[PDB]
Write a protein that binds this ligand. Structure first.
Ligand code: ADP
Length: 1263
């Protein structure tokens, strides 16, 4: 019946067009039957033609009938397409579409046509066909919809053509793999059809929404643009991943395709936010693809060159895309960043291609408006903490996961720079985000993930050097290795911040999770010590030592492969298994730290900073008792146990004595970041430049902290001590990181960001730290037994002709020649003891001419060093009568010494606008072009003027980054200039503390013989400093006296000389003569100090005859009787000098205290001008040691109390001040404030019992 009605309606039998009512009735019946039937039943029964009769009936002249055959054919091909294309294999889809579309009744179906039926019909048509027939159909069908048929019908066919292109692009974009054979060329044909039909898509997407002709045109065109821009990137990625594996591809235009949809519009259209997001994910699709670099011996192939040109065009277009995005307003920009669209921007920051990286860094600068890269990254970490710290970790981790020969290289240079940017935006001690806020659950994970990511990137950069060294130059690899080493150092320097931010119990828990990423990058570190570079080995050694010390501190282990590689490298097995160029210092340093150096100083800081300075006792508040000197310590550790409280007590007495006479003004600090980092309450502040320059704020400088208005005399307030820990010279204001003590700090509740304090300074730790270093590293000296047992070299006697022979060489004495010859003969410690006028410095100078026929000569004050330098420079005579001249060097920091100073000798051998003009000029063109814009020709200019502003701004930032290269190469020249100077010099002179500098560990020095002058006027741990450098012969010369017998029999500072003198007094070269002092100036401090044994020189009364002693009041000796100021002595000294002037280098005025020294200098400079600063030497007793003048004016303030702080030092002060003159000594002071002291009372009694007293009004008595 169905076939009989088909035969009735067939054009084969009837040979005529049937009436349209029968046609529509028949196809409505077919629709009812097909709704009743099933697809499997259609394939089984209906397929076994009705389809050909449908094609014949599709040519009727009725609009309704043509609509029913179209709806029918849609239902047939949708319900089962396999039978549809099996039963119609004779007719192609081309002829199907042409036969349907050439019908004369189809035009009013279009005209009389919430999508229309034809759009869904063509969706079913495209989905019903295989991929291989997609292209040829399109070559008709789109050409028939867009062009041949071209207004509701025109809008309908335009919508239809957009639907075809969208359906084909979505079909190709949803595939799991595009094959390299026919698949790539049909994708290429579709993309060429998209490029050809681009203008119609542009006018389609430019339509206004809500229009009567917009039936879905704009959304379809937008989806077409999105899918085309995704498919271009996917095709390029597929082609790259094919030709990098040496596979056949085939023998497109991505730049033009990106450029067309760029140049359509981006501001001033609907959905520009969505277009920008789609373009950003499209450029995220291809973020780890790099151009091809040929090998050194090989050449580039043809296909790789063609791919390089194509990739050049594509990356230029992508860079123009990213540069165009910096015209949006900040509101939509921060909406785009905050909102999965930040990942392409952050990945563009890393990229190795120049255009994409420059465009991304400009976009990052434009979003936050912080016009600097590190400031931009800091502001991004401030606003978007977890999105940015996740995007950076993902973008870096995506590229450092595989180590092969196809690994990218140009991406590894700007990974380190961005890691440095994040680190100095995250851990700065004033602008650090980790010093300001507490961390929640998500931020902890973000910071942890960034830590693991950056250490993995450093490990990947170090590991694959060998596979990279076959295709690049030598200089880029050397500079790359140096940069990676410096980044590793900067990364490992900041682990305490992570431990005390990512958490006393949880501190160790957080620290244990910080040191796990550095353990992975350990074998890579212990492989770069084999190179022939001299700068890299220093940094690798430092990083290995710091990592191993921190790992052994917190209780863990090193990887076994790193230890095995280090073990098979520095041990003899007789040669080494791996040839190195290491020295003998690095080998010892490693072979130790692994299992003569500088120890840590972190318990000393807490022991001195847990103190209250206003304690009224004579002992420290903590438990530190002393008074035990056993003189025969047979062990270094018992020596350490004895001499550590002997160091703490000395520091306490120095602190109190410096609190008495501080002479420093206070300054105010404001807290910038409070944080319990590295166990101490490390507070930071920004001190102005003028205060830091005026007060000399260096590291190791000790200050007070108080809330009081005058922190030196308010003990009732809230206060503590601090040590300056790190000083950084910023632009103007110095950044100072004070360290505190959070174990009883009274200001600790009052500590708050924004709390202005008042701070005054006391002393420096440098000598105490050097004494600690000498105490701890005494265990590796070569003079162990002589230091511990206090045994000098034995005494022995010479013949009576060589003594006269050496006496007749330097014109010496029988006391000063036997010592010369004995110290020439034997080795070890030789002791020479004399009062302050014998000639001990004269003996030492003749020793140098005796020994040199290099040397280190040391003295505990600077004045004795200056005297030794001048005497050793003036003239040297050998042991033949010959006048030679040796080379002199000063290892310190006077006028004549300034020409032989090591700091001056090293320094003497040592001695942007174009880019700024381009950036200012290029910014002027952007202002004119943008206001003129708000068309095609203009947009090419505004895209090419703005790329040079990206290019110049990259060159401006690269100018600042080049300063690190100039700063490093300055340092290797300094270590080589220093080492040359240290070998040309014949004699070298320094202080006891200055010779133990930290800079002599990395240099090559060996001083086999040390000479110490004034060895008995210093603490015992000071003379143990310049003995580390292989010294095996030391000569100790000094003065074991300067204390009276009632005071000689404290114990915290005696000497090294005094212990040996009390242990072995039989072998000490005594010098009993004197050769400067008049018999009065030699007769009173004799009987006070030297028990009538200091005998005067031959006929010295006649030698000391200068006129002035013609007056009894102005003789060689006369005592004058008049809060460490005492202006009365200032007026009396002024009157005495005025009297002597009324009646060059021979007049000196001496005060024992710094405040009266300041008053003396102020008053004298006042009315006697500035010429008396050099005429009369104004210095204390601590700056006048070892020297002499003809006339001296001594003015002491007042006697310290007997049981109080001081006393011993004031007695030593008085005895230094008394015996500095050769002709005249004039002592001043009042009687009432001086009779409290015992020895001043003995002095004033000796003054009366020999007519040496002047009392009453001196000012009337002088006139
Ligand atoms: N044998 C000598 N003959 C002549 N003068 C001497 C002799 N020995 C020392 N002097 C003088 O004695 C003074 C001692 O000064 P110096 O040696 O610098 O201090 P000290 O004796 O404390 O080491 C020198 O000025 C020197 O001129």
């Amino acid at each position: 019946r169905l076939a009989d009605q088909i035969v009735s309606l067939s054009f084969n039998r009837l040979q005529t067009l049937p009436p349209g009512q029968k046609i529509l009735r028949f196809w409505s019946g077919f629709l009812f039957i097909l709704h009743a039937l099933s697809e499997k039943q259609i394939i089984n029964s209906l397929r076994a033609s009705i389809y050909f009769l449908a094609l014949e009936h599709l040519g009727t002249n009725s609009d309704e009938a043509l609509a029913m055959v179209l709806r029918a054919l849609q239902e047939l091909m949708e319900k089962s397409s396999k039978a549809f294309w099996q039963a119609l294999e004779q007719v192609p889809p081309n002829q199907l579409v042409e036969e349907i579309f050439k019908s004369a009744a189809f035009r009013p179906l279009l005209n009389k046509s919430q999508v229309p039926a034809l759009a869904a019909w063509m969706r079913a048509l495209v989905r019903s066909l295989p991929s291989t027939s997609w292209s040829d159909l399109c070559e008709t069908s789109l050409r028939h919809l867009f062009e041949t048929f071209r207004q509701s019908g025109r809008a309908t066919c335009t919508l239809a053509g957009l639907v075809t292109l969208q359906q084909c692009l979505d079909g190709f974009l949803q595939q799991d793999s595009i094959d390299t054979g026919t698949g790539l060329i049909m994708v290429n044909q579709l993309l060429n059809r998209v490029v050809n039909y681009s203008e119609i898509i542009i006018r389609a997407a430019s339509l206004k929404p809500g229009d009567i002709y917009n039936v879905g045109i704009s959304k379809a065109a937008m989806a077409i643009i999105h899918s085309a821009l995704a498919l271009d990137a996917k095709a390029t990625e597929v082609e790259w991943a094919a030709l990098i594996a040496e596979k056949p591809v085939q023998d497109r235009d991505s730049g033009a395709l990106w450029e067309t949809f760029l140049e359509m519009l981006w501001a001033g259209q609907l959905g520009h936010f969505e277009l920008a997001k789609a373009m950003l994910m499209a450029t995220l699709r291809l973020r780890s693809i790099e151009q091809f670099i040929p090998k050194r011996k090989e050449q580039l192939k043809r296909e790789l060159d063609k791919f390089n040109k194509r990739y050049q065009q594509q990356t230029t277009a992508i860079g123009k895309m990213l540069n165009r995005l910096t015209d949006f307003e900040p509101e939509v920009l921060d909406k785009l960043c905050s909102d999965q669209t930040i990942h392409p921007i952050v990945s563009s920051l890393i990229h190795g291609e120049d255009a994409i990286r420059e465009a991304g860094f400009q976009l990052l600068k434009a979003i936050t408006s912080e016009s600097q890269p590190s400031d931009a990254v800091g502001r991004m970490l401030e606003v978007y903490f977890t999105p940015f710290l996740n995007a950076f970790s993902q973008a870096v981790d995506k590229l450092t996961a595989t180590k092969d020969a196809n690994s990218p290289w140009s991406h590894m240079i700007p990974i380190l720079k961005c890691s440095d940017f994040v680190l100095t935006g995250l851990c700065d001690p004033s602008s650090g985000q980790l010093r300001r806020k507490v961390l929640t659950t998500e931020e902890h994970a973000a910071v942890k993930r960034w830590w693991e990511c950056v250490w993995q990137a450093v490990d990947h950069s170090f590991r694959m050097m060998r596979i990279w060294h076959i295709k690049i130059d030598k200089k880029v690899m050397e500079d790359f290795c140096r940069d990676v080493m410096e980044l590793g150092n900067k990364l490992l320097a900041q682990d305490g911040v992570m431990a005390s931010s990512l958490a006393e119990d949880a501190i160790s828990k957080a620290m244990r999770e910080v040191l796990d990423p550095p353990r992975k990058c350990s074998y890579s570190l212990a492989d770069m010590l084999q190179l022939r570079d001299k700068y890299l080995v220093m940094g690798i050694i430092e990083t290995i030592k710091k990592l191993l010390s921190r790992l052994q501190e917190n209780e863990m282990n090193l990887p076994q492969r790193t230890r095995g590689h280090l073990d098979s490298m520095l041990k003899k097995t007789m040669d080494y298994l791996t040839k190195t160029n290491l020295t003998d210092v690095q080998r010892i340093e490693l072979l130790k730290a692994l299992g003569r150096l500088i120890p840590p100083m972190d318990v000393l800081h807490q022991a001195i900073l847990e103190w209250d300075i206003f304690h009224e006792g004579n002992d420290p508040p903590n438990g530190y008792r002393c008074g035990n000197v056993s003189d025969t310590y047979p062990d270094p550790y018992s020596y350490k146990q004895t001499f550590f409280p002997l160091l703490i007590n000395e520091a306490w007495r120095s602190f109190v004595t410096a609190k008495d006479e501080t002479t420093s003004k206070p300054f105010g600090i404001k807290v910038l970041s409070r944080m319990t980092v590295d166990k101490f309450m490390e507070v930071t502040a920004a001190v102005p430049a003028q205060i830091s320059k005026d007060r000399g704020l260096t590291e190791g400088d000790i200050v007070i902290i108080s809330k009081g208005e005058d922190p030196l005399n308010q003990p009732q307030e809230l206060h503590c001590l601090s040590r300056i820990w790190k000083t950084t010279y910023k632009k103007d204001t110095v950044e100072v990181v004070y360290r505190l003590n959070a174990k009883g700090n009274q200001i600790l509740p009052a500590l708050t960001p924004g709390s202005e304090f008042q701070v005054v300074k006391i002393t420096n730790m440098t000598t105490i730290e050097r004494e600690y270093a000498a105490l701890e590293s005494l265990q590796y000296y070569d003079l162990m037994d002589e230091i511990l047992k206090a045994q000098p070299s034995p005494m022995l006697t010479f013949g009576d002709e060589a003594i006269k022979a050496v006496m007749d060489n330097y014109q010496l004495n029988p006391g000063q020649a036997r010592a010369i010859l004995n110290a020439k003969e034997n080795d070890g410690f030789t002791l020479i003891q004399g009062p302050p006028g014998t000639g001990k410095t004269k003996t030492i100078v003749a020793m140098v001419g005796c020994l040199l026929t290099k040397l280190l000569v040391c003295a505990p004050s600077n004045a004795a060093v200056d005297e030794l330098v001048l005497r050793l420079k003036a003239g040297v005579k050998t042991m033949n009568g010959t006048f030679h001249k040796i080379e002199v060097l000063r290892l310190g920091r006077n006028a004549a010494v300034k020409d032989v100073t090591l700091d001056e000798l090293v320094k003497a051998r040592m001695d942007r606008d174009q880019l700024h003009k381009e950036a200012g000029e290029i910014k002027a063109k952007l202002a004119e072009i943008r206001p003129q814009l708000d068309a095609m020709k203009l947009q090419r200019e505004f895209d090419e003027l703005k790329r040079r502003q990206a290019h110049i701004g990259a060159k401006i930032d690269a100018d600042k980054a080049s300063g690190n290269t100039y700063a490093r190469e300055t340092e290797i020249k300094r270590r080589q200039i220093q080492q040359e100077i240290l070998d040309k010099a014949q004699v070298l002179c320094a202080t006891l503390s200055g010779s133990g500098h930290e800079m002599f560990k990395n240099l090559n020095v060996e001083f086999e013989t040390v000479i110490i002058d004034e060895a008995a006027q210093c603490v015992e741990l000071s003379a143990l400093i310049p003995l580390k450098y292989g010294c095996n012969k030391c000569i100790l010369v000094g003065d074991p006296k300067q204390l009276p017998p009632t005071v000689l029999s404290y114990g915290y500072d005696q000497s090294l000389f005094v212990r040996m003198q009390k242990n072995h007094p039989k072998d000490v070269h005594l010098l009993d003569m004197q050769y400067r002092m008049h018999p009065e100036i030699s007769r009173f401090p004799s009987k006070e100090f030297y028990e009538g044994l200091l005998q005067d020189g031959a006929d010295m009364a006649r030698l000391r005859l200068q006129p002035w002693h013609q007056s009894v009041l102005l003789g060689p000796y006369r005592f004058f009787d008049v809060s460490l100021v005492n202006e009365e002595e200032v007026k009396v000294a002024m009157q005495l000098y005025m009297r002597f002037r009324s009646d060059t280098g021979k007049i000196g005025i001496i005060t024992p205290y710094k405040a009266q020294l300041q008053r003396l200098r102020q008053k004298f400079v006042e009315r006697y001008g500035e010429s008396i600063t050099e005429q009369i030497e104004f210095n204390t007793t601590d700056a006048f040691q070892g020297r002499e003048c003809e006339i001296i004016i001594f003015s002491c303030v007042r006697a310290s109390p007997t049981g109080g702080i001081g006393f011993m030092t004031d007695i030593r002060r008085m005895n230094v001040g008394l015996t500095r003159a050769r002709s005249s000594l004039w002592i001043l002071g009042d009687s009432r404030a001086l009779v409290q002291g015992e020895f001043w009372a003995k002095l004033i009694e000796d003054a009366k019992q020999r007519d040496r007293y002047t009392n009453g009004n001196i000012m009337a008595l002088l006139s």
